[PDB]
Structures are given as structure tokens and as C-alpha cells.
Enzyme design. Structure first.
Site, PDB file in Angstrom:
ATOM      1  CB  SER A  33     -36.068  -3.205 -24.297  1.00 47.49           C
ATOM      2  OG  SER A  33     -36.880  -2.365 -25.088  1.00 47.49           O
ATOM      3  CG  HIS A  92     -32.130  -0.923 -23.409  1.00 47.33           C
ATOM      4  ND1 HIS A  92     -31.721  -0.190 -24.502  1.00 47.33           N
ATOM      5  CD2 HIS A  92     -33.273  -1.543 -23.779  1.00 47.33           C
ATOM      6  CE1 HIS A  92     -32.586  -0.352 -25.488  1.00 47.33           C
ATOM      7  NE2 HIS A  92     -33.539  -1.166 -25.075  1.00 47.33           N
TER       8      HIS A  92
END
Length: 157
Positions: free
Chosen positions: A109, A131
Site C-alpha cells: 500500500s 499510505h
């Protein structure tokens, strides 16, 4: 489709599959991100944590979103560009994750976000600490690029 995209996407699939076939515990111990003064020097650890996934969705989402957009970067900026982004966003989103929460995090991610981060700005112009910091590495990197690009295009027909 891209060669490094596919080596990488391939790689996350094998390791997941193997996490199932007997132990993840080998895998997770070898790849986790340094938790430990000694492990500091175990240099694959800065990156390798990106290659382990925690669920069928954790991986299906990360691989779709990275195949497709990692796809883009490689086919448009080359394979080196994608490799750098992988390597740099891997190390940084991890460095940032370890500090806020410690070394218990896994997957692609942070990487995917850097990847989308870099495609968004570049598109925009010339058309969960991991993220955010990833997104940022993306957003920043692309802008630097875009800038050097336009820089040389200035002495061109």
C-alpha cells in the site's frame, strides 16, 4: 505491460501462496523491517516487508492497483523509474511506519500510494502512516520530475 511491474506482481503472489503452504513464520521473520539493533544492518529489511500480504483482499487490492498504475509508470517513464520508486517508497514508507507504530506492518500500500501519488501529479500537470508518507513520496517525486522535464524542453522545437 511492464517487466518490473510483472516481476514485482509475480513476487507478491509466490510469497503469499507460500505463506499458505506451511509457514508464514519463516517468511514474516526474514522480511519484517528491523525491530532490533542487529537487524539494522540486515539491509533487505528496509524493502522486503512490502512483499508480504496479510489477507486475500489485502493482496487482491494492492496487486490490482499496483499492476495497473505501476503498469503506467514503467510503460511511460521506463523500468528504472519504476524500480527506483519501488525501492525508495519501500524504504521510506517503512521508515515512517516503524516510527509511529513499530515494525509490524506488511505489503504494498505505501508503495501503491507513492505510485498513485506520482501518477496523479504528473497527470495533473502534463496529462496508515505508510499510505500518507507514500502518497507524499509520490506527489513530491513526480513534481521534481515534471520540473526537470519542462526544464530541458525549454531548449527544444
Amino acid at each position: 505491460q511492464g517487466k518490473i511491474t510483472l516481476i514485482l506482481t509475480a513476487l507478491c503472489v509466490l510469497i503469499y501462496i507460500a505463506q499458505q503452504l506451511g509457514f508464514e513464520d519463516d517468511i514474516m521473520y526474514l522480511m519484517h523491517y528491523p525491530a532490533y539493533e542487529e537487524q539494522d544492518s540486515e539491509v533487505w529489511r528496509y524493502i522486503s516487508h512490502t512483499l508480504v500480504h496479510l489477507s486475500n483482499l489485502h493482496i487482491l487490492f494492492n496487486l490490482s492497483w499496483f499492476f495497473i498504475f505501476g503498469g503506467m509508470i514503467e510503460r511511460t517513464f521506463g523500468s528504472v523509474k519504476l524500480l527506483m520508486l519501488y525501492v525508495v517508497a519501500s524504504a521510506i514508507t517503512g521508515y515512517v511506519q516503524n516510527y509511529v507504530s513499530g515494525p509490524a506492518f506488511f505489503g504494498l500500500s505505501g508503495v501503491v500510494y507513492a505510485v498513485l501519488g506520482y501518477v496523479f501529479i504528473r497527470d495533473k500537470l502534463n496529462h496508515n502512516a505508510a499510505h500518507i508518507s507514500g502518497l507524499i513520496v509520490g506527489l513530491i517525486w513526480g513534481f521534481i520530475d515534471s520540473k526537470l522535464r519542462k526544464n530541458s524542453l525549454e531548449l527544444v522545437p
